Amino acid sequence: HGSPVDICTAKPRDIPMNPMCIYRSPEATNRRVWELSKANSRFATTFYQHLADSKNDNDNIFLSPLSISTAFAMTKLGACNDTLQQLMEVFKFDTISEKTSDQIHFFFAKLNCRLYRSSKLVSANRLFGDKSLTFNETYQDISELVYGAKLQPLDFKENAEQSRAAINKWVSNKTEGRITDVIPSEAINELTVLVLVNTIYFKGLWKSKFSPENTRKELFYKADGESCSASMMYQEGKFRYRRVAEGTQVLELPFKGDDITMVLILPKPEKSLAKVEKELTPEVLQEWLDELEEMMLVVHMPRFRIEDGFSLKEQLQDMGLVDLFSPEKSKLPGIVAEGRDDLYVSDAFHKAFLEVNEEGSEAAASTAVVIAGRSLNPNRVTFKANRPFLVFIREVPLNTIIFMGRVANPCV
Amino acid sequence: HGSPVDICTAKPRDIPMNPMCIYRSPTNRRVWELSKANSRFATTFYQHLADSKNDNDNIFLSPLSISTAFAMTKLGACNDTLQQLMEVFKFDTISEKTSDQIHFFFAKLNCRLYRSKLVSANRLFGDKSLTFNETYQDISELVYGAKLQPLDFKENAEQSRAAINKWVSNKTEGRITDVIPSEAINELTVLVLVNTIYFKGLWKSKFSPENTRKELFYKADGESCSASMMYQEGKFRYRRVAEGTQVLELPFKGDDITMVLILPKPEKSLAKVEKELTPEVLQEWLDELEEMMLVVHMPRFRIEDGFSLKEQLQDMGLVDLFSPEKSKLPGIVAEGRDDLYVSDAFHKAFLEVNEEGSEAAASTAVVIAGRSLNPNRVTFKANRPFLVFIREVPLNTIIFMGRVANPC
Ligand SMILES: *[C@@H]1O[C@H](CO)[C@@H](O[C@@H]2O[C@H](CO)[C@@H](O[C@H]3O[C@H](CO)[C@@H](O)[C@H](O)[C@@H]3O)[C@H](O)[C@H]2NC(C)=O)[C@H](O)[C@H]1NC(C)=O
Ligand SMILES: *[C@@H]1O[C@H](CO)[C@@H](O[C@@H]2O[C@H](CO)[C@@H](O[C@H]3O[C@H](CO)[C@@H](O)[C@H](O)[C@@H]3O)[C@H](O)[C@H]2NC(C)=O)[C@H](O)[C@H]1NC(C)=O
Ligand SMILES: *[C@@H]1O[C@H](CO)[C@@H](O[C@@H]2O[C@H](CO)[C@@H](O)[C@H](O)[C@H]2NC(C)=O)[C@H](O)[C@H]1NC(C)=O
Ligand SMILES: *[C@@H]1O[C@H](CO)[C@@H](O)[C@H](O)[C@H]1NC(C)=O
Ligand SMILES: *[C@@H]1O[C@H](CO)[C@@H](O)[C@H](O)[C@H]1NC(C)=O
């Protein structure tokens, strides 16, 4: 009698499932799966902000924070010491009050089971290790059981570029031809050892379809004030909506099953999207969603397609002292007379001197922090018009942000 | 009737410390814990600095000085600005609770440090036309002894610049003269927080001029030049650690302040030693250097360095995972290969919205590799570039540190 092992159902009894190292973290569904979605959502918003920071407000942005959280959780499996701790912290997995890092994989397995079990929402993970190497069995086993990531051998040593073409094809296969060149040229060479890959594919139909005979060409105004032609869709009906504080709007468009929805966030005609992006936290997002009431309204949005991509190594390691140097984001309310927070460090310098001779040595140094007050120029476009907005594709019962981004240019 | 409020004496309760905001982070153990944090910023920051420079250029800074100035700047920070500040400077690793308690510990440490000559002076220069918050002003005077001198930025930037620079020059015996560059201050400048640190000690074991000789020094780019090398033999704390690195400690009259020189073995690049550098590693080396009779020979030289902190700090978010040296992934390959690191990682995404619904896709690829090679052009035994640390031993504090890449 043979029975296929399944983590969703229960853990094996003999197959060892313990990572090589362990990090003990500080401090209406499953408490575990819930707290993990909360951590994931915390990485999504935090990462998004940093991402949006390094880009031009005229550029679109689109990513799957869940996808990223998944790939690195998979990579975490073999991490140790400091590498493991940083990973735990960077992805907010350590915000799960008291819990060893190895428990994260199982909660992650419980989440993926609930997510990928109306509207198509699939995911596939895979490991591509070099054929000449011998990979650790427990690692290979945990990866297959927790993330369903089997290890496929490739010849990086002798056939890098062909191996790359292989991994890219696999991913094109798991995303219906949508993601074709995930791994760039020269990214893989004879020194490569293992490539961990995650993919997520989603395609749903509106619970409340739009009718083609109602789409119209209209001018859409970008952040820099320039305009372009856009096809705007139109329909009126009952939709969950809400006009929050400062005038921000939140609109939820659900897909056939109702458990996956698209949430649109538009700032007040006078305020910029950047104001809404910096204020974005997982709690704020939750408050908005919470206080959403259904009502008769006219939904007016552009039909478009956007493709985006970026290096995580680059983005992840550039999260240092950012706010203090930003006129918009800097918060230094304590310095001046009465809360004046337009203060920000315009620049800081350091000078040092060292002399060593027969009698001894002399050393000097000075650090200068230069704070200045400034402002943000007014927004070019103030009149009501089609402007850029935020987009989220959520799984509601699981409180999970699958996709998210900024639709800054839905043209041509 | 009147007793000056002195923090070096006081206990947490006595000193009323209330900053605008607070941050909750996850028994002189504190002063100790603070020095560790500073030391951790020190190494982290150095590695990043060394990284963006040419291995042929010298490097010299005072991490303590930067930590101090930004700690002073932290007094008026809030929300995300305050958290980042707490984290980037590793203050969030101090087993405490509220972000305000570190200014109390930093004061305790500055007390022990500044009472060989080792002094420090901090001052705030605000625009005369503005009104500065009284509490902020009081706390900066109490904790860092930073008084607020008014200057006319709004009307006389260039003159005010000259003023601040002259004060710095005064507190560093004319060593640091142009800390603040031109155009760095203008009509919109509001406040300039300045820290200063000066040190001058004599060797506990002086060097004799009659023994200095010009010797060839080989730089990182291969070429060689002449340097005046000092010579003397005696008992010094030393040690030839793992991977063949040498650590030498030359103390100053008083023993409480010392210079530590770090030299990698011939076939190892200084750059690789810089990249592997961690507070713990540094500690272990220092921890048990044995005293022994040996011939110490080092160059006599001077180096002056300066740089903008914005660029550096803005990107201080590195993760060992992307570091060939520091990455730890012993669980992937059988037996435990240590050299595994993520060479790069990519994300790609797609979204299409139309009348019928929407379609989204995405992939994340993490590429792990091993066998990273650090260029090494001077692999023979000769005078080469080394690391320099000037530390306070009873307070395990790194006051100054740098790279001597060209004493010529
Ligand atoms: C200067 O910055 C100060 C921060 O260091 C800031 O102090 C805060 O001021 C408020 C109001 O004066 C205090 O709140 C008081 O009032 C509330 C309600 O009236 C009481 O419940 C409180 O107990 C308290 O009595 C804050 O406590 C105080 N924060 C501190 C110092 O702990 C000043 O407001 C700033 N002043 C200027 C000129 O802007
Ligand atoms: C593959 O990675 C494994 C981590 O998931 C790692 O597991 C460790 O394997 C060793 C065996 O060498 C276990 O040590 C055992 O042996 C002693 C004496 O026989 C026992 O007393 C111990 O309690 C233990 O059972 C480790 O405990 C085990 N680590 C854990 C926590 O699972 C393998 O070593 C790696 N294998 C290869 C090929 O590198
Ligand atoms: C930044 O943090 C401070 C607290 O450290 C927050 O201050 C509170 O602001 C609200 C207004 O929304 C007031 O009702 C409270 O009285 C404030 N608390 C204090 C200091 O008494 C502030 O809201 C935070 N700002 C952000 C980024 O949301
Ligand atoms: C890394 O952690 C392991 C246990 O997880 C420990 O045995 C080892 O000494 C650590 N490595 C270091 C930092 O020396
Ligand atoms: C620096 O300031 C002191 C007083 O604080 C003054 O006496 C001294 O002359 C100044 N330094 C010099 C010599 O310029």
PDB file of N, CA and C in Angstrom, chain A residues 346-347 349 370 372, chain B residues 157 161 179-186 189 192:
ATOM      1  N   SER A 346      20.461  67.894   3.923  1.00  0.00           N
ATOM      2  CA  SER A 346      20.805  68.131   2.529  1.00  0.00           C
ATOM      3  C   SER A 346      22.113  67.425   2.228  1.00  0.00           C
ATOM      4  N   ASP A 347      22.935  67.242   3.257  1.00  0.00           N
ATOM      5  CA  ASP A 347      24.217  66.580   3.081  1.00  0.00           C
ATOM      6  C   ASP A 347      25.017  66.546   4.375  1.00  0.00           C
ATOM      7  N   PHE A 349      29.133  65.661   5.893  1.00  0.00           N
ATOM      8  CA  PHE A 349      30.512  65.421   5.497  1.00  0.00           C
ATOM      9  C   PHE A 349      31.363  64.860   6.617  1.00  0.00           C
ATOM     10  N   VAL A 370      24.399  68.605   7.799  1.00  0.00           N
ATOM     11  CA  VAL A 370      23.792  69.853   7.338  1.00  0.00           C
ATOM     12  C   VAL A 370      22.302  69.766   7.026  1.00  0.00           C
ATOM     13  N   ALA A 372      18.564  71.232   6.229  1.00  0.00           N
ATOM     14  CA  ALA A 372      17.984  72.369   5.548  1.00  0.00           C
ATOM     15  C   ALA A 372      16.484  72.199   5.417  1.00  0.00           C
TER      16      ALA A 372
ATOM     17  N   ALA B 157      25.688  82.983   4.180  1.00  0.00           N
ATOM     18  CA  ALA B 157      26.096  81.591   4.171  1.00  0.00           C
ATOM     19  C   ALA B 157      27.615  81.448   4.183  1.00  0.00           C
ATOM     20  N   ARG B 161      29.873  79.609   6.921  1.00  0.00           N
ATOM     21  CA  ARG B 161      30.632  78.413   6.613  1.00  0.00           C
ATOM     22  C   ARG B 161      32.013  78.578   7.205  1.00  0.00           C
ATOM     23  N   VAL B 179      36.122  71.174   6.714  1.00  0.00           N
ATOM     24  CA  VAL B 179      35.113  70.129   6.836  1.00  0.00           C
ATOM     25  C   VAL B 179      33.884  70.400   5.977  1.00  0.00           C
ATOM     26  N   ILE B 180      33.407  71.639   5.990  1.00  0.00           N
ATOM     27  CA  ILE B 180      32.231  72.007   5.207  1.00  0.00           C
ATOM     28  C   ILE B 180      32.639  72.706   3.919  1.00  0.00           C
ATOM     29  N   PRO B 181      32.332  72.098   2.762  1.00  0.00           N
ATOM     30  CA  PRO B 181      32.680  72.665   1.457  1.00  0.00           C
ATOM     31  C   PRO B 181      31.838  73.875   1.062  1.00  0.00           C
ATOM     32  N   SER B 182      32.177  74.486  -0.069  1.00  0.00           N
ATOM     33  CA  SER B 182      31.447  75.657  -0.553  1.00  0.00           C
ATOM     34  C   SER B 182      30.138  75.232  -1.208  1.00  0.00           C
ATOM     35  N   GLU B 183      29.123  76.083  -1.077  1.00  0.00           N
ATOM     36  CA  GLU B 183      27.813  75.812  -1.652  1.00  0.00           C
ATOM     37  C   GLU B 183      27.064  74.733  -0.866  1.00  0.00           C
ATOM     38  N   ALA B 184      27.698  74.223   0.185  1.00  0.00           N
ATOM     39  CA  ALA B 184      27.084  73.200   1.025  1.00  0.00           C
ATOM     40  C   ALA B 184      26.053  73.861   1.940  1.00  0.00           C
ATOM     41  N   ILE B 185      26.204  75.168   2.130  1.00  0.00           N
ATOM     42  CA  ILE B 185      25.293  75.940   2.961  1.00  0.00           C
ATOM     43  C   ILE B 185      24.763  77.106   2.136  1.00  0.00           C
ATOM     44  N   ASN B 186      23.485  77.425   2.305  1.00  0.00           N
ATOM     45  CA  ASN B 186      22.892  78.541   1.578  1.00  0.00           C
ATOM     46  C   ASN B 186      21.704  79.102   2.332  1.00  0.00           C
ATOM     47  N   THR B 189      19.540  76.794   4.489  1.00  0.00           N
ATOM     48  CA  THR B 189      20.128  75.982   5.563  1.00  0.00           C
ATOM     49  C   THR B 189      19.492  76.358   6.890  1.00  0.00           C
ATOM     50  N   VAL B 192      23.263  73.097  11.512  1.00  0.00           N
ATOM     51  CA  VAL B 192      24.392  72.233  11.188  1.00  0.00           C
ATOM     52  C   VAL B 192      24.958  71.647  12.470  1.00  0.00           C
TER      53      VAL B 192
END
